Design a protein around this ligand. Structure first.
Ligand code: ITD
Ligand code: ITD
Ligand code: OLC
Ligand code: OLC
Ligand code: OLC
Ligand code: OLC
Ligand code: OLC
Ligand code: OLA
Ligand code: OLA
Ligand code: OLA
Ligand code: OLA
Ligand code: OLA
Ligand code: OLA
Lengths: 456, 466
């Protein structure tokens, strides 16, 4: 049983993969570095980390021509570069994924503890990244530095890690699997496990919208003109007695409240109102046609207005409603800002109009537009990171099965495993291009066809 | 060829003896912890909550030591199932206890580093995350032992052990034991304590807490006697009669229909804006500007507090006192600040502020730091001793690692001597199980009674020498 490098495929396929990453990798990462680094000052936290990522990737990527030459012909470059390219490899595998781990910590802080997230998020991204990521990443390369050497072999020079015995191969494989994927994977998933759980105490989108706009009372309240209210703007009945109002709540809740209720029960009581509200809209001839043409988010917008102004009032916005039914969002946003509604209750009306305008929930929340895109960028990056690496992981797993005697096959099986590990690893280095590619076409509009080069 | 021979002369005598001792003192010690806290206790600290989990870990393992002793002295008489079970329980214990220690260190880190708001997260760690992140992983990681622990016939007896396909499996699992067992919990503990000792001297209070104490915290809108509407930490909203107009300003700022009520969290946000306005004005006031720049975090908090009390014009007027603070001569500046009208009028608050300018610590806004320091001392002792117990065994394993990895090349005799000292030291390392109970020994006791104090009522005038 001997090693057998294949000419037709690996000797040609790998250096090509290596060269393309090299090429697209210097340009893409080099652009991220100069574009944010040199020129552009005000930096977003995720962007701060993506600067780090692109530095880690350009460093690795500038060493790829060695890999390519090594694969096609020989290791002409001596012992010292041998250790150097190995070190540079380790540095990349560890820093890249942990920077990703740090992007997920940052998202956790942003979302889960948004109240005083700035002091710490800033601290993470400017002080802790060097001590948590870069320095350990370098310390951990001492092993590559020690055992990476060049040997003469079968008419060429191999640069590789050479150890006293086969146990050393298992020790460093286990460490690579641990520092590379299992520990950062634990942290990424844990952070996202905490995020999704924080997002589970909140109720429906329409409920959190109106809680913000109308307010949420957990205890009955007599106002100044004698009416009784609870939950999200829920009016109990005609009685002028706290007791008889408490009688009404008890009936709608199904329990002896004594004037206090829970959030969950307020959401249920609100759902019934939202329902009764939506029913009358579908009975109003002016409002129903618009409601039929709107997406859910924008229908929440119109329900909000009914919650505030009564069905009749809302039904008087004849020209704004008409632009909304026609999907003329900007016009309609513009027109609604000129009404007595806007001039009297701008805080509310501003959020509602932004909902109609965009068809998003950005107006609620702090910096909601920015936070929405930030969450999506992060998840895309990390999933794609692991997606690039996944076929290599499967390859390495199969090799592990050989060594640990989980499977027993001949050498022809073992040598096909090793060529596909060389292939899937090469294909994995595309991770170095994702960060730049996710920055492509920012602010582009895809609205031009061959006819639009010839006409309006 | 080197063969494994089991040692008797000392080892069939020494290990059962040590196992039996840890067995007896550990059952009594940990069982007491479990009964005395587990049930009676009503005011329990976080560290104590953790040391109950610890004593449960340790009792589970200690109760299985009789099997170890009989195994060492005679046989494995207990069949395949128990062979797996004593392993599982062994692995559960090695993992759970060291990680409980790591959680005791994360808890300490929150208690000292973030005392603006520790209580929710420390409560969460102690009652929920300890299960899902300590116990459950510990249990899941025993699946190997359950699978590979089996009973074998070897040299005139039954051998209970983990038997694998090949020697690479020995390596894969030992590295996991060292990692999960030592190097990951070690990293966590040492990182926590790196952050602590680096910040111990400037802890105890935030700028939020400082002013929350000097100025008070209002979750509800309050109208004072001169018509001013205020919220949170002295946040002025409006000064005209409508209350509803006050609400609308609060709503614009907070970004939601408050009805004049905000959370403690929104109050800190209003405050952090206000703090960024006062700093912005200080950096444009030429009288306050260069003094601010020369000051640490804590002493800047001390200036911003004054600006909130008596406004920017006022603080720009303590001309001599500020130069003193700028020169970094704290005591005379603190002597001088106590001679001002501000001090005679609001002495309590200004006493505190000056203490901050003088010493640069939050001592005036912080304590019950006599109990907190006793909490830190206990945790450091518990943890250091734990590692101290385990250290001779780590040295043995490291020696064994050198053999397999060919970092050294000695013969069979040398390997045999290492094998026996690893058994010795692991055995001794199990005293880790009695630390937790011992540390609770003698609470309330005073060591003042000599034989003479039993023969008499003491020596004359003991109260002079207390
Ligand atoms: C994990 C690792 C860094 C280790 N390694 C290896 C083993 S060394 C090596 N050459 C280079 C790998 C990359 C660093 C420089 C040496 N072998 C062969 C020799 C025959 C021709 C093809 C490559 C191949 S690809 C790979 N990736
Ligand atoms: C790490 C470990 C759990 C593994 N192990 C071992 C190896 S198994 C073993 N018997 C027992 C270990 C403890 C659990 C029950 C089996 N060996 C010998 C057999 C000959 C006489 C002395 C003990 C000894 S002490 C120890 N501790
Ligand atoms: C839960 C985690 C476990 C999930 C299963 C994962 C890996 C099992 C590996 C299976 C190995 C497949 C051997 C290939 C095979 O079928 O070979 C046997 C035989 O020679 C053919 O006739
Ligand atoms: C394949 C990688 C090349 C494609 C990447 C394009 C370069 C790019 O998008 O860089 C812009 C810069 O990052 C703006 O911040
Ligand atoms: C066993 C002794 C105490 C634990 C009691 C719990 C019962 C555990 C089952 C014991 C067992 O499986 O014993 C196998 C063997 O037959 C034994 O001689
Ligand atoms: C790195 C030191 C290498 C030697 C580590 C020795 C083994 C560590 C181990 O398994 O320790 C048990 C753990 O402390 C139970 O809580
Ligand atoms: C970073 C952490 C350092 C990496 C650990 C290095 C090598 C792991 C494999 C070494 C195997 C050690 C053998 C010890 C052993 O199993 O012996 C104990 C006892 O004799 C049995 O009962
Ligand atoms: C031959 C050894 C090669 C190893 C090189 C190791 C380089 C690590 C040193 C510094 C990491 C780069 C830090 C990037 C900072 C820019 C990002 C920013 O300022 O926001
Ligand atoms: C589809 C065609 C693929 C061909 C492989 C591409 C290889 C390009 C990458 C690196 C080329 C390096 C050339 C090595 C020089 C050594 C040759 C020699 O000196 O004899
Ligand atoms: C699980 C089985 C194998 C894991 C493969 C080793 C992980 C490679 C790390 C590369 C990386 O993600 O940075
Ligand atoms: C988001 C886009 C994901 C890009 C596709 C990643 C697939 C990885 C396959 C591979 O590179 O081997
Ligand atoms: C939580 C997920 C559980 C999966 C655990 C994965 C841990 C990895 C376990 C064993 C890896 C040991 C390395 C095997 C030797 C391979 C070396 C080689 O391919 O040359
Ligand atoms: C505890 C010690 C008990 C010893 C087990 C019996 C010894 C034997 O029968 O050989």
């Amino acid at each position: 049983c001997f090693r057998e490098e294949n000419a037709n495929f690996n000797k040609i396929f790998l250096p090509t993969i290596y060269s393309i990453i090299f090429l697209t990798g210097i340009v893409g990462n080099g652009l991220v570095i100069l574009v944010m680094g040199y020129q552009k000052k005000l930096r977003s936290m995720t962007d701060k980390y993506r600067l780090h990522l692109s530095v880690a990737d350009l460093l690795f990527v500038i060493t790829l021509p060695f890999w390519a030459v090594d694969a096609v012909a020989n290791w002409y470059f001596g012992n010292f570069l041998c250790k150097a390219v190995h070190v540079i490899y380790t540095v990349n595998l560890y820093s890249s994924v942990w920077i990703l781990a740090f992007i997920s910590l940052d998202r956790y802080l942003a979302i889960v503890h948004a109240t005083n997230s700035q002091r710490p998020r800033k601290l993470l991204a400017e002080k802790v990244v060097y001590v948590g990521v870069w320095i350990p990443a370098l310390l951990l390369t001492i092993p590559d530095f020690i055992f990476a050497n060049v040997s003469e072999a079968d008419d060429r020079y191999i640069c590789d890690r050479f150890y006293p015995n086969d146990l050393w191969v298992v020790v460093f494989q286990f460490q690579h699997i641990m520092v590379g994927l299992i520990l950062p994977g634990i942290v990424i998933l844990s952070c996202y496990c905490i995020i999704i759980s924080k997002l589970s105490h909140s109720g429906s989108n329409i409920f959190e919208m109106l809680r913000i706009d109308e307010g949420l009372r957990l205890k009955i309240y007599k106002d100044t003109e004698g009416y009784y209210t609870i939950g999200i703007g829920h009016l109990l009945t005609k009685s002028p007695s706290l007791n008889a109002a408490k009688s009404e709540l008890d009936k709608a809740i199904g329990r002896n409240t004594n004037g206090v209720i829970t959030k969950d029960e307020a959401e249920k009581l609100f759902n019934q109102d939202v329902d009764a509200a939506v029913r009358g809209i579908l009975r109003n001839a002016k409002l129903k046609p618009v409601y039929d043409s709107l997406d859910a988010v924008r229908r929440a917008a119109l329900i909000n207005m009914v919650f505030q102004m009564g069905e009749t009032g809302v039904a008087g916005f004849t020209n704004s409603l008409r632009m909304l039914q026609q999907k003329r969002w900007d016009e309609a946003a513009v027109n609604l800002a000129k009404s007595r509604w806007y001039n009297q209750t701008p805080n509310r009306a501003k959020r509602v109009i932004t909902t109609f305008r965009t068809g998003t929930w950005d107006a609620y929340g702090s910096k909601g537009h920015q936070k929405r895109k930030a969450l999506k960028t992060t998840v895309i990056l990390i999933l794609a990171f692991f997606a690039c690496w996944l076929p290599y992981y499967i390859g390495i797993s199969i090799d592990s099965f050989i060594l640990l005697e989980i499977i027993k096959q001949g050498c022809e099986f073992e040598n096909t495993v090793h060529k596909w590990i060389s292939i899937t690893e090469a294909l994995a280095f595309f991770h170095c291009c994702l960060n730049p590619i996710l920055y492509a076409f920012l602010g582009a509009k895809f609205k031009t066809s061959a006819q639009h080069a010839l006409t309006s």
